[PDB]
Design a binder for this molecule. Structure first.
Ligand SMILES: CCCCCCCCCCC(CCCCCCCCCC)(CO[C@H]1O[C@@H](CO)[C@H](O[C@@H]2O[C@@H](CO)[C@H](O)[C@@H](O)[C@@H]2O)[C@@H](O)[C@@H]1O)CO[C@H]1O[C@@H](CO)[C@H](O[C@@H]2O[C@@H](CO)[C@H](O)[C@@H](O)[C@@H]2O)[C@@H](O)[C@H]1O
Ligand SMILES: CCCCCCCCCCCCCCCCCC(=O)OC[C@H](COP(=O)(O)OCCN)OC(=O)CCCCCCCCCCCCCCCCC
Ligand SMILES: CCCCCCCCCCCCCCCCCC(=O)OC[C@H](COP(=O)(O)OCCN)OC(=O)CCCCCCCCCCCCCCCCC
Ligand SMILES: CCCCCCCCCCCCCCCCCC(=O)OC[C@H](COP(=O)(O)OCCN)OC(=O)CCCCCCCCCCCCCCCCC
Lengths: 178, 93
């Protein structure tokens, strides 16, 4: 993990959000009914440019900040970023229950997105179709998609921890008399 | 010669831009059809310049001689309403 540059990445996000909001404003101006001039596009925008810009800032800044602070990259950062984005979008309601609902539910949806890999298409190399599968050979380490008939007991002790039935030695062997 | 004849392709391009704008801005849709015919003559000019005079003649034979004729025939027989280009209607785009 080497850090994201939160400031520069966030500035890039600001630019892109402003551009996207401008485009959405132009489309909104062309699709609507009633009289419309070239300056009314922002007048009758619905604040759409602000929607785009604020969402961009919130998501990118929070994501980079959380990633740098935890020194990890995983779905939790996207959960935080979605929480902040939902906070921005739910501020428009001007009601505290709705603000909270947007916060938690957008955060949960984006955490779900980040947990699946934070992509809409697939990571082809990691997928089961492009991976070692089936039963492993003689004494190889088990990888994510591979299956064995017996795992090493040391691995079980490491992963589960000792206690509540997980032991480094089977009981009957250990309690044998001589 | 050389100065004009070197930029014949560029002149066809400029004329094509102008002809398309005139197609879209025409008050009478029959005038729009005529500007479409003009654009097709310009396309035939370009095709001759790049060595395809046979396609120039084919385009004149088929798109002007047949398709534009059908266009005019239809607009003559049919009752078409059209509005004019204006700021009130089109500056919003
Ligand atoms: C019922 C609820 C459903 C919701 C839960 C689903 C969540 C899925 C998550 C788990 C999973 C897909 C598993 C699919 C299995 C079936 C799918 C189940 C049904 C799906 C509906 C996605 O794992 C993802 O987790 C994300 C973090 O949250 C990451 O986010 C990103 O992080 C950053 C990028 O670097 C970025 O900054 C950013 O892009 C994101 O931040 C993703 O990159 C990562 O791919 C894990 O799969 C993968 O696991 C790894 C090691 O485990 C496997 O390779 C291993 O290599 C060695 C170690 O590496 C091991 O030694 C070796 O043994 C093994 O070979 C892989 O081969 C692969 O298989
Ligand atoms: C400069 C470079 C930086 C900018 C690059 C960013 C590009 C994004 C620009 C997108 C602009 C937004 C498009 C838009 O204006 O959509 C609005 C349009 C109608 O929406 P509107 O009339 O305003 O309101 C109706 C509300 N009931 O709705 C539409 O008809 C547009 C249809 C959607 C646009 C296609 C996008 C496909 C991707 C959708 C993502 C789906 C989510 C998947 C996850
Ligand atoms: C009938 C209807 C029933 C539907 C059931 C509910 C559907 C889902 C509701 C919404 C859930 C949203 C979950 C957001 C999860 C946030 C997140 O970032 O998950 C990442 C987390 C760890 O991922 P990882 O990067 O691999 O970290 C490894 C460290 N041990 O991954 C995890 O460890 C799991 C964290 C969430 C635990 C499950 C939550 C309940 C499901
Ligand atoms: C420049 C664009 C095209 C580039 C080169 C031309 C390509 C070949 C053209 C083939 C000739 C047939 C098609 C000609 C296009 C028709 C032009 C046209 O649309 O004329 C009708 C239009 C009438 O519109 P109107 O109502 O009078 O507008 C008033 C606005 N206050 O009138 C107008 O809109 C303006 C007046 C037009 C006058 C046309 C004069 C030329 C007549 C054709 C001569 C052909 C060459 C001979 C060596």
């Amino acid at each position: 993990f080497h850090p994201y540059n939160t400031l520069g990445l966030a500035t890039q996000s600001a630019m892109v959000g402003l551009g996207a909001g401008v485009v959405a404003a132009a489309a909104r101006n062309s699709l609507a009914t009633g009289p419309r001039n070239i300056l009314t596009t922002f007048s009758k925008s619905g604040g759409v440019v602000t929607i785009f810009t604020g969402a961009s800032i919130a998501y990118v800044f929070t994501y980079c900040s959380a990633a740098n602070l935890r020194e990890r990259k995983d779905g939790w950062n996207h959960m935080w970023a979605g929480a902040a984005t939902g906070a921005v979008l739910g501020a428009r309601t001007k009601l505290v229950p709705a603000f909270i609902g947007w916060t938690v539910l957008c955060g949960a949806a984006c955490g779900l997105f980040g947990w699946t890999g934070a992509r809409f298409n697939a990571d082809r190399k990691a997928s089961l179709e492009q991976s070692p599968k089936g039963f492993v050979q003689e004494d190889a380490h088990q990888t994510f998609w591979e299956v064995v008939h017996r795992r090493p007991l040391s691995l079980t002790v490491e992963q589960l921890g000792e206690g509540r039935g997980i032991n480094a030695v089977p009981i009957a062997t250990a309690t044998e008399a001589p | 010669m050389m100065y004009l004849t070197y930029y014949f392709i560029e002149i066809t391009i400029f004329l094509a831009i102008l002809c398309t704008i005139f197609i879209i801005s025409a008050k009478n849709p029959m005038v729009s059809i005529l500007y479409m015919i003009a654009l097709f003559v310009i396309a035939a000019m370009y095709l001759y310049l790049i060595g395809l005079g046979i396609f120039s003649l084919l385009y004149i034979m088929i798109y002007i001689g047949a398709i534009a004729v059908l266009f005019l025939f239809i607009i003559t027989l049919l009752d078409i309403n059209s509005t004019e280009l204006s700021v009130k209607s089109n500056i919003r785009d």
